[PDB]
Each structure stands twice: as structure tokens, then as C-alpha cells.
Write a protein that binds this ligand. Structure first.
Ligand SMILES: [Ca+2]
Ligand SMILES: [Ca+2]
Ligand SMILES: [Ca+2]
Ligand SMILES: [Ca+2]
Lengths: 340, 340
């Protein structure tokens, strides 16, 4: 028990003001949808960021502060620990370049009232950040080894070169892990996807849908949730045709949805891949809207499709390519847990 | 009652063999996923096509036969009537270049065992096609004027130039109608969409989702179905938590889903736009999973998004642009109805 880092990398979200300051570097304001609080969005990110690095350096920890474009596998090795300073976006980016279950990576919600932060330290430590560093020293914290999906590409016509979205061959290992998910599907969101899935080495079934989602326990509150969740206005629709027991009050409408959406979440440390079929098109038959597994391999039959890991890295997955997802231990990422 | 066409355009799907014959014009076979029946897919499309045009010309109707690239607004005006010779794909393409509620357009399912055809003449007339032409002469048919969504772009940063996916400003009218749907949403399928909707001139609510669908009565069996339909394996999941009346047999599981999915379809002649929010993300609050309206206008707040009409034409719809959908009479498309 106990942990003080000697050197850390702070990798910072690039705010939406930073965006245009460099994007349109080629008054101002323009549309009323800016400046009013856009330069304030920026002012409070850099505020919090300076508080973090002021509070690191004031405890004698050595910090390099770097943005999306200057954060690489080389700086991560200098780091005893890694800090994402943004939202979960930033956390996912910071986890992308870590592949070592003993490097800790910790997210600080650099802007609470509009970032979400469900992978970062509580909103408390965003502004009382020595209180965090002290808890780390004194060991009043806990280790959360988060499960991560590992990728594997083979087949023919394949191309394992990764693509930063921020702009006859053997089984190659793709160089990102998935903290949140791996989303297979067609590029044109209107072109339907077609493939053959195989769960836990079971037989191959054909499928036609708007894509495949493949999440970790921790990623089950992210995309795999919006895929599969039900709506309270459409359980009233389902429970009223289920009329022709209960008198059906509004209190019940929420207590049937809230126990349904509660089964779609499992635990970060749990080592299962919850893989759902997004809007399946039921000929090729369907069933299993979703299910838990350990290994799933899908065979691409698409024209121009990608498999996309945590929304930031993309891989080609046109007809002839094969991918294989599996949780493996040396992938699990070392997060911390603190107090309200 | 009665209708004989004097000249017709037959516009033909380009088969998947035609694809590669010209795409890789830059033995053969390659992957086992071809040739076995790929050159047979082609052999039976051109077969049926020749039967159609043989059966036109043998009744003394004058036909120009043209493919995707040679079918234009000029040939549609020569035509007394227009024939799509493919699947609904082809039908939607053929309707794209017609904007005149008195031109008839008729689809012939050029390949029944793998095309679907739910906008074309029955599978009967694909091979007994004079039997169709005779029914047209003798008036043993019926006119189906199918409702069509009409598009309207304004605002700033906008760009109303259409994009064939087959590769301070006033309200401009976009030059495609929607037979099936109009799908607003972000281009990266992982980037979330954000916008402000306004139904029937009601107030503007903000929204965050994986896009917007906007279908006609006829388009309600297409995409708007896969968006909103329920699964029989996840009503068992909903009706078993709705346990803690019925004993729940498998016969019921289908009869509650089949009456739910039955309310998501309305009639082609019905002039309402059923607009659903695709996987809404409930801060900006949500409700109304879908609802009927006559006019809906949405205000783009996206970075790199398109609105896509019938899957074939795309328009930019980044922040600052405004679109407005509405059914108007001179759009309704003139289809026929025949017998089993
Ligand atoms: Ca300072
Ligand atoms: Ca290739
Ligand atoms: Ca002939
Ligand atoms: Ca623009």
C-alpha cells in the first residue's frame, strides 16, 4: 500500500478555442454560437491544468505537459505515471499509448460542468488536487485494473496500419487495446453491414446489421448502453399492448426500465466482452441481440468498412479480412479509485 | 382507366459482376467468395432485362436501355414512363430523377431470389412481363401516388450541392425528394450528433443522438423500421422483470412484438413524416423517441455531418446550416399496383 510518482506526463485535451486558434491560423467571433463562453471554456481548462501541474511540482514531482500531438510511446516510458487532463476522451487517448499493466494512468476532469468524467477522479480533486496526491502517498486509495479488449487481424486484402481519427497472411496484433469498445461496421452509415460471426469458437452465422459493438465491462456504460437501452415512452407502448396484473402508474414505468438498463452494465474488472448486434436486420436469420463471451471472431464481407477502437483509431475491414477479440491479462489498465 | 406507354426508359442495376468487369479493368476468380455464382448473378439479371425489353418492343413500345451512369433528367423527359430494372435500390435511383406526379415509374424485380422488391411489381411479372403490359392496357391495375419528403436548406456555411454516393442565405430547395427517408447525422459513426429540432413549428429542443431519421409512409418499412423495431429475445427480458397476469408462452412473445412493430408502419399515401431519434442520448433532455408530424426543421450543430436522402445523395450539414422537411403534393410519385 502506497504510491508516489517521481515523474509524470500530463497530456491535455485541446480545447475548442485551441481548435480554431490553430485551425483558422491560415473581431472574429462570427456566429453567435461562440466567444460568449467559448473563450471561457478555454479559460477554465487551462486554469485547472495549471492547478494540476502547480500541485504536482509543489510536491516535487517532475512533469512534462504535452498535448494530443506531442504525447507518444516514448514520453509514456519516461513517465512513472500518466495523467489525462480533459474528459474521458483524453483518458481514452492516454490509455491508447500505455500497454503496461503497472503504469498507472489517472484522469482529472479538467472541466466538470460540461465534461462527464466517468473514468476520472471525482470533481472534488479537480480543484483540491493535492488532497488527491496526499491520498496517493498515504494509500487511502484502491487499484482498479480495468479490462481491455485486444485485437487481431488476418486474412487477405487486409491492412493493419492504424488510422488516427483525430487526423495470405498470418494473425497480426493490432497496436491499440480497447478500453471502451471495438465497433465493426460499414463506413457509409446507410450501407448495411454483412459478416459471419463466431462466438467462443462456435459455428459461423451470417449476419446483416448496422454494425457490431464489442465492449469491456467498463465500456458497457458507453456505447454498448445507447445501443441496447430501452426508452420509458416505448415501454408504456409495450406494456399497453401487453394489456389486451398491474394498473400501470408512472412509478412502475421507470422501475421496469431501470432494472432492464441495470443488466446491461457489468464490472470493469470482469473479463467478458459484451457484444451486441446494432439494429440487426432479420434468409440470414438473427437472434442473440447481445451476449457475453470471451472470444469472438468476425469475418468481413463488407465493401468499405472499418473497425474502430475507442472512437480514436480505425482499421480497414473490407471483404477478406478477419478479426478476433479477446481479453488478455497484460492488457488490463491500471486506474485508481478515490473518494467523493 | 387505362394506360399504354409510347416510349420508356429502362434503367438497369449494375450487377456485381459488371462492377469488377469495369472496376478492375485497370483465370481471375481470386477468393472463393465469387465466380461460383457471381457470373450466375449476372447471367440472370441480363436474362430478365432482355425479357423486359423484348416484351416492351414486341408490343411496339420504344425503349432506350440505360445504366446508372447514363440515366439523367433529359432521358426521363423523353420517357412516357420509367422502368427501374433491379431492386428497390434501382427504384429509388429511378425516382431520384423523376419529379413529376404524372410520370409513372414502375419497378421490375430483375432478380427475385436475392433482391427484395417491396417497391416493384410482384415476382410473377418478372418473367411473365407481357401479362403486366396487358393488365396496364386493360386497366386491371391501380394508381399508387406515394408520398415524398421535400428538402430545404438555408443558414450559413451551407453547401446545397448534391453528392452521388455511388461516386447569410435564403431557403434553397434541394434537388432530390425522399421516397424512403432523410437521415441526418454525424459522418464518423462514432462522433455523436448534436442539433436543435422543431416539430410543426414548436419550440426548439436540443438533442444528442446517433442521428435523425425522417421517413415517408412508404419509407417506414425501410430504415425507420430497423431503428425502432423490438426484438423477441428482449421482450422476454422485459416481460420477466415485469413479473416481480400471463403465464408467458412463446406464442405470446411473438404476438406482443408483432403488434408493436405493426404500429411503426403507415400508409404510402399517408402524408406524414414519421421522424425518430436514432439511439437518443439522455443536461439536454430527451423524450419523444418518435412521432408523426407534417413539418420538422433541424438546426445543425455538428462538425462534419451529412443529411442523406434515400441513401444515394448526400448534403453537408455542419454547424450553421438549417434544413426543413415537408410533404408537398407535386412531389408524390406515381407507382402502380398489380396482382400476386
Ligand atoms: Ca501558476
Ligand atoms: Ca485491401
Ligand atoms: Ca432477345
Ligand atoms: Ca461550410
Amino acid at each position: 500500500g502506497g504510491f508516489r510518482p517521481s515523474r509524470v506526463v500530463v497530456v491535455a485535451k485541446t480545447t475548442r478555442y485551441e481548435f480554431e486558434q490553430q485551425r483558422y491560423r491560415y473581431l472574429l467571433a462570427l456566429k453567435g454560437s461562440s466567444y460568449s463562453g467559448l473563450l471561457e471554456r478555454h479559460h477554465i481548462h487551462t486554469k485547472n491544468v495549471e492547478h494540476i501541474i502547480d500541485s504536482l511540482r509543489n510536491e516535487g514531482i517532475e512533469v512534462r505537459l504535452v498535448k494530443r500531438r506531442e504525447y507518444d510511446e516514448e514520453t509514456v516510458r519516461w513517465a512513472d505515471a500518466v495523467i489525462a487532463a480533459g474528459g474521458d476522451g483524453t483518458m481514452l487517448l492516454a490509455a491508447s499509448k500505455v500497454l503496461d499493466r503497472l503504469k498507472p494512468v489517472i484522469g482529472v476532469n479538467t472541466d466538470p460542468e460540461r465534461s462527464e468524467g466517468h473514468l476520472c477522479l471525482p470533481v472534488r480533486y479537480t480543484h483540491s488536487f493535492p488532497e488527491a496526491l496526499q491520498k496517493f502517498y498515504r494509500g487511502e486509495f484502491r487499484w482498479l485494473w480495468r479490462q481491455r479488449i485486444r485485437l487481431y487481424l488476418e486474412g487477405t486484402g487486409i491492412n493493419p496500419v492504424p488510422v488516427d481519427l483525430h487526423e495470405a497472411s498470418g494473425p497480426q496484433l493490432l497496436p491499440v487495446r480497447a478500453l471502451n469498445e471495438v465497433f465493426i461496421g460499414e463506413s457509409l452509415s446507410s450501407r448495411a453491414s454483412y459478416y459471419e460471426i463466431s462466438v467462443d469458437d462456435g459455428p459461423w452465422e451470417k449476419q446483416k446489421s448496422s454494425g457490431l459493438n464489442l465492449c469491456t465491462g467498463t465500456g458497457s456504460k458507453a456505447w454498448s448502453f445507447n445501443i441496447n437501452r430501452v426508452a420509458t415512452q416505448a415501454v408504456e407502448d409495450v406494456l399497453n399492448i401487453a394489456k389486451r396484473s398491474l394498473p400501470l402508474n408512472r412509478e412502475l414505468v421507470e422501475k421496469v426500465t431501470n432494472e432492464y438498463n441495470e443488466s446491461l452494465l457489468y464490472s470493469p474488472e470482469e473479463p467478458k466482452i459484451l457484444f451486441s448486434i446494432r439494429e440487426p436486420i432479420a434468409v440470414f436469420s438473427s437472434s442473440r441481440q447481445r451476449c457475453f463471451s470471451s472470444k469472438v471472431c468476425v469475418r468481413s464481407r463488407c465493401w468499405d468498412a472499418c473497425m474502430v477502437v475507442d472512437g480514436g483509431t480505425s482499421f480497414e475491414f473490407n471483404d477478406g479480412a478477419i478479426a478476433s477479440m479477446m481479453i488478455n491479462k497484460e492488457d488490463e489498465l491500471r486506474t485508481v479509485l478515490l473518494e467523493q
